[PDB]
Amino acid sequence: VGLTTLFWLGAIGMLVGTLAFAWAGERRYYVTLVGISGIAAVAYVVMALGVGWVPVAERTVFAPRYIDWILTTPLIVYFLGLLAGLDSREFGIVITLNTVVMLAGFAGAMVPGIERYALFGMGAVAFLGLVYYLVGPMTESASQRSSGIKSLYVRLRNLTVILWAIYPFIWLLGPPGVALLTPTVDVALIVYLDLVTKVGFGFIALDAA
Ligand SMILES: *C/C=C(C)/C=C/C=C(C)/C=C/C1=C(C)CCCC1(C)C
Numbered sequence: 096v097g098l099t100t101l102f103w104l105g106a107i108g109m110l111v112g113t114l115a116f117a118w119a120g121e122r123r124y125y126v127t128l129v130g131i132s133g134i135a136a137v138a139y140v141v142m143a144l145g146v147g148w149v150p151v152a153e154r155t156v157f158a159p160r161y162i163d164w165i166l167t168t169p170l171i172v173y174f175l176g177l178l179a180g181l182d183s184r185e186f187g188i189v190i191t192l193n194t195v196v197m198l199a200g201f202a203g204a205m206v207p208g209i210e211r212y213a214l215f216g217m218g219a220v221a222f223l224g225l226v227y228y229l230v231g232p233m234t235e236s237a238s239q240r241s242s243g244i245k246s247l248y249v250r251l252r253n254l255t256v257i258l259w260a261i262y263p264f265i266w267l268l269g270p271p272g273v274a275l276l277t278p279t280v281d282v283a284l285i286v287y288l289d290l291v292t293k294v295g296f297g298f299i300a301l302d303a304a
């Protein structure tokens with residue numbers, strides 16, 4: 096099982112999700128889910144073709160992964176913000192916090208020296224602030240909606256919080272960090288997480304609709 100095989104698997108999974116969401120497509124929600132998995136599909140194909148594998152010191156960094164995350168994770172937060180009924184100002188805070196996490200990870204991965212752990216730490220701090228907004232203010236806000244919408248928000252929120260919290264550990268234990276986990280295992284774990292936090296996320300929304 097090679098890296099390219101794992102990338103192709105993620106590509107196929109994202110593509111199936113993309114077509115499923117487009118078919119089922121309230122247009123805003125369905126269009127967002129197409130963007131979430133559609134962008135990831137492209138990133139995985141590019142990586143499957145061997146494009147964007149950047150050598151850094153003694154590790155290999157996958158640049159398309161971080162461009163993907165920077166564009167798709169704010170769309171996931173946007174989806175959750177619509178469910179919770181955020182005003183346009185609360186959106187700005189959480190999307191700003193999200194972008195800090197994603198940019199810090201991208202920069203830390205691309206830096207060869209130990210300064211990269213300083214960048215990782217900053218993303219960790221901003222992530223804790225993002226979790227606070229999901230579990231607190233956004234949950235208060237979602238409470239004002241129908242019982243079914245509130246229930247859907249809580250289920251997507253917990254899926255999001257629990258799984259997103261695993262990524263920094265995979266990053267740190269993998270090549271970008273202490274380089275303990277091997278690239279193949281590290282990639283396999285992230286392909287699984289990407290698929291669940293995007294396509295699984297999406298199908299839980301379809302089921303409730
Ligand atoms: C579809 C892709 C998803 C949901 C990716 C999520 C990625 C994260 C939650 C990554 C978080 C990170 C930290 C909290 C600190 C810095 C390193 C990151 C980017 C792995």
Ligand SMILES: [Cl-]
Pocket residue numbers: 155156157160204271
């Ligand atoms: Cl990486």
